[PDB]
Design an enzyme around this catalytic site. Structure first.
Site, PDB file in Angstrom:
ATOM      1  N   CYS A   1      33.618  36.127  11.983  1.00  0.00           N
ATOM      2  CA  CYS A   1      34.567  37.193  11.668  1.00  0.00           C
ATOM      3  C   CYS A   1      36.033  36.784  11.809  1.00  0.00           C
ATOM      4  O   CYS A   1      36.586  36.097  10.948  1.00  0.00           O
ATOM      5  CB  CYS A   1      34.278  38.402  12.565  1.00  0.00           C
ATOM      6  SG  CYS A   1      34.900  39.981  11.940  1.00  0.00           S
TER       7      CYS A   1
ATOM      8  N   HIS B   1      36.132  36.456   8.232  1.00  0.00           N
ATOM      9  CA  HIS B   1      35.960  37.775   7.655  1.00  0.00           C
ATOM     10  C   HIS B   1      37.004  37.820   6.546  1.00  0.00           C
ATOM     11  O   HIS B   1      38.170  37.501   6.776  1.00  0.00           O
ATOM     12  CB  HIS B   1      36.257  38.868   8.676  1.00  0.00           C
ATOM     13  CG  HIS B   1      36.258  40.246   8.094  1.00  0.00           C
ATOM     14  ND1 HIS B   1      35.128  40.829   7.564  1.00  0.00           N
ATOM     15  CD2 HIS B   1      37.258  41.144   7.928  1.00  0.00           C
ATOM     16  CE1 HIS B   1      35.431  42.027   7.095  1.00  0.00           C
ATOM     17  NE2 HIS B   1      36.717  42.241   7.303  1.00  0.00           N
TER      18      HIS B   1
END
Lengths: 187, 187
Positions: A105, A125
């Site tokens: 992420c 991400h």
């Protein structure tokens, strides 16, 4: 002896990206140590879920090398990780001794901060590509999971299982990965 | 307005099945109350993750009505849920007032133990099928997520996101769910 993993738990860490890998790796037989960036005090994650670390990063560091260091995502957590000197130490050591490093992420941004793995093809991400590419110190990937050398990166909460299973495979092999993935009921 | 959720966390609960729903619902603006069965003390989950509940179940029972009661899975966790006379009352009343009840993996067996939603169509982890169908009190389903009116069940850790988003849809409509699923980078 079992493989060992170090998951650094920073206030504001995405709890799904924290728990999913810990759970999955432990299913793999890996001995995981959830270390709190600030003592063994309960940690408040991105969505107020409260997790208690097994030990502090301070006491955890004292436990020599790990076969893998995991960096959870979550903006706030990713900042705290990025601003920790104790975290740079751990990543420098892990990198120099050729140990795997896994970040998902927003977590990979903690790598750019401590200048870990420059030149490495990575992923993050979607909403953190430009920042991760702030300096051209890496090559971007859109792959849900990206493994370039000892730098393993993933996209987000929805790629946590793949991310975690990627780690299991790298440390314990594909047979152990498939077994751990069996009872999970994935895709 | 802002819907509310009751997540009953018991010792031995599967931590991924606990965290994913809590995180997802909150991301959807739902007010989630992680309440500990045994009390206000941190609970050790199935893979040793330690989670601090928002409040004891006793105190949560006081916190107004809940749009949805969520039962995480995990062998021991489910078992503890099934043997709880307190959980029985909570479930019976949520059902009576036509409130949504959600259980995943082994969590469904708690519904059986408390004779909740008999005759409904349900699914469970493949390894708890016979147990759940013992006595033919339900119609079994192979679906990753089964919503039979006010009874929503799911299969396992790997179906936690679909399970969670299904709840979000059931409470806030497929609109909010769509917005919540977007940043997760799911399949």
């Amino acid at each position: 002896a079992s493989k060992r993993a170090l998951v650094i738990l920073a206030k504001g860490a995405e709890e799904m990206e924290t728990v999913i890998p810990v759970d999955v790796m432990r299913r793999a037989g890996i001995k995981v140590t959830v270390a709190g960036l600030a003592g063994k005090d309960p940690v408040q994650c991105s969505r107020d879920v409260v997790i208690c670390p097994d030990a502090s990063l301070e006491d955890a560091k004292k436990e020599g090398p790990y076969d893998v260091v995991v960096l959870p995502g979550g903006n706030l957590g990713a900042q705290n990780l990025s601003e920790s000197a104790a975290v740079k130490e751990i990543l420098k050591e892990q990198e120099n001794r050729k140990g795997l490093i896994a970040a998902i992420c927003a977590g990979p941004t903690a790598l750019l901060a401590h200048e870990i793995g420059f030149g490495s093809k990575v992923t993050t991400h979607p909403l953190a590509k430009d920042k991760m590419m702030n300096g051209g110190h890496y090559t971007y990937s859109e792959n849900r999971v990206e493994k370039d050398g000892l730098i393993l990166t993933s996209r987000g909460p929805g790629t946590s299982f793949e991310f975690a299973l990627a780690i299991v495979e790298a440390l314990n092999g594909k047979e152990v990965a498939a077994q751990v993935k069996a009872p999970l009921v994935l895709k």
